[PDB]
Amino acid sequence: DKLHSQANLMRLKSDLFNRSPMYPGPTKDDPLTVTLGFTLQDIVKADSSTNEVDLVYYEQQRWKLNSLMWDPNEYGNITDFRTSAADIWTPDITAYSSTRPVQVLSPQIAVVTHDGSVMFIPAQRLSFMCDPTGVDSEEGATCAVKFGSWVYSGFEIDLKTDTDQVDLSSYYASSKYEILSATQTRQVQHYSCCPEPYIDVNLVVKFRERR
Amino acid sequence: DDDDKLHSQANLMRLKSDLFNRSPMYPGPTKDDPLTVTLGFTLQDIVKADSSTNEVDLVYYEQQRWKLNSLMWDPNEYGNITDFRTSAADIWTPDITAYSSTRPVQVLSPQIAVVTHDGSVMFIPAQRLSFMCDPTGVDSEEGATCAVKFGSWVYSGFEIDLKTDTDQVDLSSYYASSKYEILSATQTRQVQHYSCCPEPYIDVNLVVKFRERR
Amino acid sequence: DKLHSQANLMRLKSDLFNRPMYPGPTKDDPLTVTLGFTLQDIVKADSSTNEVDLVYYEQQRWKLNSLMWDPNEYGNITDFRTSAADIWTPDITAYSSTRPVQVLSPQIAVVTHDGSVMFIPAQRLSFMCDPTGVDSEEGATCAVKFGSWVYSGFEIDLKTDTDQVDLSSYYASSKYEILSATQTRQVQHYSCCPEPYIDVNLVVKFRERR
Amino acid sequence: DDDKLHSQANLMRLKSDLFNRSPMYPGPTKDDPLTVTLGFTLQDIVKADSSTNEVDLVYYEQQRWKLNSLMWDPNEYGNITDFRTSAADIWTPDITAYSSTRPVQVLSPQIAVVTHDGSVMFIPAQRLSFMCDPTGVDSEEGATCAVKFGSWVYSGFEIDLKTDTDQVDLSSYYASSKYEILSATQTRQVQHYSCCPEPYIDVNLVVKFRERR
Amino acid sequence: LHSQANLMRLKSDLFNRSPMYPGPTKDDPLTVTLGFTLQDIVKADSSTNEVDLVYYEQQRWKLNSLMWDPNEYGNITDFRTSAADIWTPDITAYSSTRPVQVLSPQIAVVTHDGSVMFIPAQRLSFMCDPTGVDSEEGATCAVKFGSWVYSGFEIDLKTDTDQVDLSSYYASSKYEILSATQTRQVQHYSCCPEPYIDVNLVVKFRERRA
Ligand SMILES: CCN1C[C@]2(COC(=O)c3ccccc3N3C(=O)C[C@H](C)C3=O)CC[C@H](OC)[C@@]34[C@@H]5C[C@H]6[C@H](OC)[C@@H]5[C@](O)(C[C@@H]6OC)[C@@](O)([C@@H](OC)[C@H]23)[C@@H]14
Ligand SMILES: CCN1C[C@]2(COC(=O)c3ccccc3N3C(=O)C[C@H](C)C3=O)CC[C@H](OC)[C@@]34[C@@H]5C[C@H]6[C@H](OC)[C@@H]5[C@](O)(C[C@@H]6OC)[C@@](O)([C@@H](OC)[C@H]23)[C@@H]14
Ligand SMILES: CCN1C[C@]2(COC(=O)c3ccccc3N3C(=O)C[C@H](C)C3=O)CC[C@H](OC)[C@@]34[C@@H]5C[C@H]6[C@H](OC)[C@@H]5[C@](O)(C[C@@H]6OC)[C@@](O)([C@@H](OC)[C@H]23)[C@@H]14
Ligand SMILES: CCN1C[C@]2(COC(=O)c3ccccc3N3C(=O)C[C@H](C)C3=O)CC[C@H](OC)[C@@]34[C@@H]5C[C@H]6[C@H](OC)[C@@H]5[C@](O)(C[C@@H]6OC)[C@@](O)([C@@H](OC)[C@H]23)[C@@H]14
Ligand SMILES: CCN1C[C@]2(COC(=O)c3ccccc3N3C(=O)C[C@H](C)C3=O)CC[C@H](OC)[C@@]34[C@@H]5C[C@H]6[C@H](OC)[C@@H]5[C@](O)(C[C@@H]6OC)[C@@](O)([C@@H](OC)[C@H]23)[C@@H]14
């Protein structure tokens, strides 16, 4: 039985990653919707001598590919699987105001469901540009960082949020800084060069020293 | 004796050939074919406790054991070889993660597992971890207390079940001249429930109580 | 229709990349690279070591006949995205760095049907810079030269579109404000050598914000 | 000149015979044990940090072993008696500092010397941070620290460790270091765990040092 | 022209149709010429006795197996190629305290006579007591470079000059250079009859007087 459930899963992955191989990313003809959400774990550091703030968070990324669809009946009623993030295409979602390379804290493994949808949730430590003036007051400090594709326009990758509230439910209760509010908002930009719209998600965090 | 050693080498190379190079890559556990992973921790040192950022750095050994039927063999068919060492990259390993780490975990030991003929794998990486921890009280008699949870990043308890052999962290090789002394260290399996999800989620909670050595 | 356009792109790349990589330029077949810097932040000015850390976007453009194709032979595809590790890229180097350059963006280029490539890496650079005067009204001045490490001007020619560094996205709440930022193409000759060598000189004047 | 082409060809063929026309040595077993000889040479104590009780050491770790599968007859190969090869082309032992606090940083090219009798010589230069309380380093007695080295996964039934001498080589120790070495020993130890019938072997590096005046 | 096609053919011919050069032996020794160019002394830490240095290490050698006749290949006399496509010598700083950090592209120039020129830029931390750096005579520091595994019977070292090149030393460094020499030395070990060759880089420096 368990030998057969393995054989089914092994066959499924072969059928997907070895027939009509590596999806080449989205195009204007075949656009992609990526949904972004953030879960904030901890503000680790606020350096007022370089105006850098260090953040630990989960970035939840979701998208759907027809080329990852399968009928569970063709494959022993397998409805989802786990696979390495290097085995599939992933979107190039970038923090636009980072000051150091993003550091990856979690295994980089995705979950693929039979409808072709992919959930990928990397935990990261990010240093970005932020003046924490007022962090030692009641008002606190406010900082913003924008995330988006580095090379794809809104005509190839459409970004969405399900909610504009950052999930704070697992924020570390004994951090040096407390979160007054945290929002994530979709924005459309245009550039004078270019006709296409460009999408980002603006993460706005207001925070202050713990009392 | 030279031939006897060549024979034993040929059998080991043939064993590994038959397991790794001519039998499909194990795709991981499913709800249909679940896996039990046993965790235990050996604490070697608390290196640093930073109250300016609430980060603490530990050095520990993390013992991982699991068992796959697809790694079984009969010693009799392979010159009575009962186990072998292999690179951890040659086999599937569980995605056990420190959930509250603040920096990438740093591996201190070679990445090599021991595989036994019953299909059990023993893998013991030595790691330095920075994690979230408020060390207030560390310079008092009562000490500070810190907790870090370990578990799969992507699997539920229907795919990867975690166990412990004991709830006591092994402190028998804890460094005698550390800046901090350990008052207590426990490791407890926890069943977690998320309101999103019907499945159980498992983690092992490592709770360390410690203070400055006088 | 979506399956066909995928298959078109897949085959274009295979035709371009799986059938003899460009071995770089020669005197007989020189390459022109255009550079433009966008300065995002001056992160740190260390007066104990005379190192300054910048964050900037570096726009790199060039054109290869070996990356050309006719859109009509490939389902009207006019450009595509690809990993910078699928194509040759110029060896443009900051000549006065004190640490390995740190890459902040995904390393992906855009290739257009006319053979043009656009590659825009975001980088954090530590380079040699005496920040004396930074706490005064005149500010400090620092200069860093970029260019090819191994190719002369006869193989890789560097150009800028403009001599003005783009400051439109510079961080409003940086510790340092920018008084001026220029990027100037320069030609040099060494006594050893008859060939010209090109560099772009990034000159930044800055001071502590008030 | 031509004869240089031939000795090249000979060495190319020797490496090909050893590494591509033969399966990779799977490591030692209880049936086919291996002796690894270990020696330490000490360059510099870089840092003694009494805020974290970590000390930084730069040292050469000399490793020697011998494999039948790396043997050849020099007469068959243009009278070549040894060669150099990337360490990644051959099996190497998993010798580890047991009390490191950071990943070891390698300072030398990872290249070994193989001799026609099958002996391999591999001498990696490393910077190691390890657990060490430097109390007394500012005194005449100095501080004493110890670190154990050995296989991470093999028992003494598979890898026997040995030393040629119990004196650490201090002949190259940096003369202008912040710290002078009073003494440095390296001692083979046989260890027993109550879990396990097999003997386990480590080499215990004991270093006595103080601030130089 | 496709002096492009000529270059591509030459590289195929040298690399993938004449196996990877195995390195030198007693029967086929190799001379490496070494020369240093100092860009900056970045840091001198008297709490650990480490000094951090930024420099170019010019490496030159010559292999018969890299020779060709320019007339067989459209009069191509040289080319650039990745340092990972050819053998390079294992020249090491013997007294480093941290891994060397590479600042430049790893690309070599190969000439038709079989000569290779490779010039990596590096930041090196090495053992050095900077006592007297704040005095008139300054501090003196020495670091030896040489092969890690080859003897003088396999790799002979030489320099072209005993003067280190200071003509591009950073003029606003915290430290000025009083003198900088590079001298071939021979060492023996009592175990062993063979000579061992190194190049000793001796730098005398002091705090720049402001
Ligand atoms: C390829 C690199 N890429 C990175 C960029 C980076 O964008 C941002 O940093 C950004 C985006 C929205 C809002 C604020 C942004 N931003 C800043 O610009 C500074 C600060 C750190 C910040 O958050 C992503 C979006 C787009 O590419 C898909 C860019 C724009 C598309 C187009 C635009 O030309 C003007 C613009 C680019 O300049 C070059 C491109 O030329 C084809 C680009 O480098 C980025 O512009 C900021 C911008 C392009
Ligand atoms: C895929 C990433 N994964 C990481 C997570 C991370 O979990 C934790 O950090 C965690 C787990 C137990 C107890 C405390 C935890 N925790 C925190 O949440 C913050 C703090 C650092 C910490 O220790 C592992 C367990 C499970 O995945 C197998 C997660 C949960 C399963 C499920 C849950 O949805 C609410 C939850 C996820 O949010 C997303 C998933 O969606 C299908 C997940 O990202 C993590 O939740 C925190 C949580 C999931
Ligand atoms: C191969 C390494 N390469 C790095 C160099 C580095 O050049 C620079 O750093 C530089 C270039 C222009 C202006 C100022 C420069 N400069 C400095 O020289 C120091 C300071 C950091 C700085 O900005 C690139 C240009 C050329 O290579 C295409 C070089 C020159 C070509 C030629 C010149 O010989 C005198 C010179 C090289 O010395 C060796 C070469 O010998 C064939 C070279 O290493 C660099 O010289 C500075 C210089 C060569
Ligand atoms: C595979 C990982 N491995 C690392 C170990 C680590 O050993 C040491 O750190 C060590 C060895 C001798 C003396 C002191 C040691 N040591 C300490 O234990 C703390 C301190 C840092 C230190 O120096 C190497 C030796 C042996 O494996 C060949 C171990 C022992 C063999 C056996 C022993 O079980 C009790 C023991 C292991 O615990 C697990 C094993 O279970 C099959 C092991 O993880 C290490 O135990 C310390 C110990 C094993
Ligand atoms: C393989 C590693 N290798 C590194 C060595 C390292 O040498 C040096 O560090 C060195 C060389 C010349 C002068 C001073 C040196 N030196 C020091 O010894 C300390 C200080 C950092 C320094 O500059 C290179 C030269 C030779 O290998 C080609 C070595 C010598 C050849 C021979 C010598 O043994 C007696 C000696 C080795 O000890 C081991 C070898 O055993 C067969 C070696 O590890 C280095 O010895 C210091 C020495 C060998």
Automatic annotation (TrEMBL), chain A:
It comes from the Eukaryota. Mg(2+) 6 binds at H190. One of its GO terms (molecular function) is identical protein binding. Transmembrane segments: none annotated. Mn(2+) binds at H4. Keywords: Calcium, Metal-binding, Receptor, Signal. InterPro entries: Neur_chan_lig-bd (IPR006202), Neur_chan_lig-bd_sf (IPR036734), Neur_channel (IPR006201). Gene3D superfamilies: Neurotransmitter-gated ion-channel ligand-binding domain. The keyword Calcium applies. Ca(2+) binds at S169. Mg(2+) 4 binds at S153, E156. Mg(2+) 5 binds at E156, E196. SUPFAM superfamilies: Nicotinic receptor ligand binding domain-like. The keyword Signal applies. Mg(2+) 3 binds at D80, E196. Glycans are attached at N77. This is Soluble acetylcholine receptor. The gene is LOC100533247.
UniProtKB/TrEMBL annotation, chain C:
Mg(2+) 3 binds at D79, E195. Keywords: Calcium, Metal-binding, Receptor, Signal. Ca(2+) binds at S168. Mg(2+) 1 binds at H4. Mg(2+) 4 binds at S152, E155. Residues 20-207 form the Neurotransmitter-gated ion-channel ligand-binding domain. CDD domains: LGIC_AChBP. Glycans are attached at N76. Mg(2+) 5 binds at E155, E195. GO terms for molecular function: extracellular ligand-gated monoatomic ion channel activity; identical protein binding; metal ion binding; transmembrane signaling receptor activity. Mg(2+) 2 binds at D79, E155. SUPFAM superfamilies: Nicotinic receptor ligand binding domain-like. Disulfide bonds join C129-C142, C192-C193. PANTHER family: NEUROTRANSMITTER GATED ION CHANNEL. This is Soluble acetylcholine receptor. It comes from Aplysia californica.
